[PDB]
Design an enzyme around this catalytic site. Structure first.
Site, PDB file in Angstrom:
ATOM      1  N   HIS A  40      34.389  37.999   8.524  1.00  9.92           N
ATOM      2  CA  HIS A  40      34.931  39.137   7.795  1.00  9.92           C
ATOM      3  C   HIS A  40      36.015  38.715   6.786  1.00  9.92           C
ATOM      4  O   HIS A  40      36.440  39.523   5.980  1.00  9.92           O
ATOM      5  CB  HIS A  40      35.387  40.262   8.738  1.00  9.92           C
ATOM      6  CG  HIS A  40      36.755  40.142   9.312  1.00  9.92           C
ATOM      7  ND1 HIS A  40      37.017  39.728  10.595  1.00  9.92           N
ATOM      8  CD2 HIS A  40      37.931  40.470   8.749  1.00  9.92           C
ATOM      9  CE1 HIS A  40      38.335  39.835  10.793  1.00  9.92           C
ATOM     10  NE2 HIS A  40      38.897  40.271   9.675  1.00  9.92           N
ATOM     11  N   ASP A  84      31.279  37.136  14.315  1.00 10.93           N
ATOM     12  CA  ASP A  84      32.315  37.095  13.285  1.00 10.93           C
ATOM     13  C   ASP A  84      32.874  35.668  13.147  1.00 10.93           C
ATOM     14  O   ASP A  84      33.967  35.325  13.606  1.00 10.93           O
ATOM     15  CB  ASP A  84      33.425  38.103  13.614  1.00 10.93           C
ATOM     16  CG  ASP A  84      34.402  38.296  12.449  1.00 10.93           C
ATOM     17  OD1 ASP A  84      34.099  37.835  11.321  1.00 10.93           O
ATOM     18  OD2 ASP A  84      35.464  38.945  12.687  1.00 10.93           O
ATOM     19  N   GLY A 175      46.058  40.087   8.969  1.00  7.94           N
ATOM     20  CA  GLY A 175      46.499  38.870   8.318  1.00  7.94           C
ATOM     21  C   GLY A 175      46.416  37.622   9.176  1.00  7.94           C
ATOM     22  O   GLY A 175      46.488  36.507   8.666  1.00  7.94           O
ATOM     23  N   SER A 177      43.604  37.320  11.025  1.00  9.30           N
ATOM     24  CA  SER A 177      42.175  37.196  11.157  1.00  9.30           C
ATOM     25  C   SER A 177      41.702  35.827  10.679  1.00  9.30           C
ATOM     26  O   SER A 177      42.161  35.306   9.679  1.00  9.30           O
ATOM     27  CB  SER A 177      41.439  38.258  10.365  1.00  9.30           C
ATOM     28  OG  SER A 177      41.600  39.524  10.968  1.00  9.30           O
ATOM     29  N   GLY A 178      40.717  35.308  11.416  1.00  9.54           N
ATOM     30  CA  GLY A 178      40.159  34.006  11.107  1.00  9.54           C
ATOM     31  C   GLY A 178      40.874  32.836  11.761  1.00  9.54           C
ATOM     32  O   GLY A 178      40.327  31.736  11.788  1.00  9.54           O
TER      33      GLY A 178
END
Ligand SMILES: [Ca+2]
Length: 223
Positions: A40, A84, A175, A177-178
């Site tokens: 995402h 994801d 923020g 994320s990942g």
């Protein structure tokens, strides 16, 4: 990260910032050429920033390397966030050192109760908004699949796990994320989603990296 602590500069040497003019997501360095992040977080024009602490100050240990290629998982579903995960290849190899280092992939899945380290430059407030400049850290346990499913009816797939604190107050956030979830020196999770951040009965939901090791290895081997 809400309810965490200041990691300390370059104490999380596999943590990267994805930059498109501005930090927008985390990621994890898995060899000199490749970063793991969340699907995402995909966008074109990514610069990978390694060796960062303060993302707004050049401190002396950074390596900024443009992405040449990004590969979203073949089965990523942006509606459910199933699968994801994405891979990002760097245009040139990073120079690995004590402050810029890969993190190992797991060899087996982690278990509920295992402590992990979650990190990022995301929001530090659960009601409001405050973005840090330096990297933040949170130690948190993996939660049981049954508690995860009960917290998020109809939403948790076999490619997700929950980690954190059902009481609230301590979580990843927008923020982050990942970015990484590392347990015993292995990358077990990727910051993926949750209901708000740090809310009671709404723990963080993370991509279950162990399910993807074969895909990661074979993708790197032919790209
Ligand atoms: Ca910096």
């Amino acid at each position: 990260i809400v309810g965490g602590y200041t990691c300390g500069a370059n104490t999380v040497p596999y943590q990267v910032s994805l930059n498109s003019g501005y930090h927008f997501c985390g990621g994890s360095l898995i060899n000199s050429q490749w970063v793991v992040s969340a699907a995402h977080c995909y966008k074109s024009g990514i610069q990978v920033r390694l060796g960062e602490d303060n993302i707004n100050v050049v401190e002396g240990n950074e390596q900024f390397i443009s992405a040449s290629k990004s590969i979203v998982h073949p089965s990523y579903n942006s509606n459910t966030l199933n699968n994801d995960i994405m891979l990002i290849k760097l245009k040139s190899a990073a120079s690995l050192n004590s402050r810029v280092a890969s993190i190992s992939l797991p060899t087996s899945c982690a278990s509920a109760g295992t402590q992990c380290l979650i990190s990022g430059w995301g929001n530090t407030k659960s009601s409001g908004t405050s973005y840090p400049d330096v990297l933040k850290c949170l130690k948190a346990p993996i939660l049981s699949d049954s508690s995860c499913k009960s917290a998020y009816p109809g939403q948790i797939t076999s490619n997700m796990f929950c980690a954190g604190y059902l009481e609230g107050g301590k979580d990843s956030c927008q923020g982050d994320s990942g970015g990484p979830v590392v347990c015993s020196g292995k990358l077990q999770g990727i910051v993926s989603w949750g209901s708000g951040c740090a809310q009671k009965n709404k723990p963080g939901v993370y991509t279950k990296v162990c399910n993807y090791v074969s895909w990661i290895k074979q993708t790197i081997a032919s790209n």
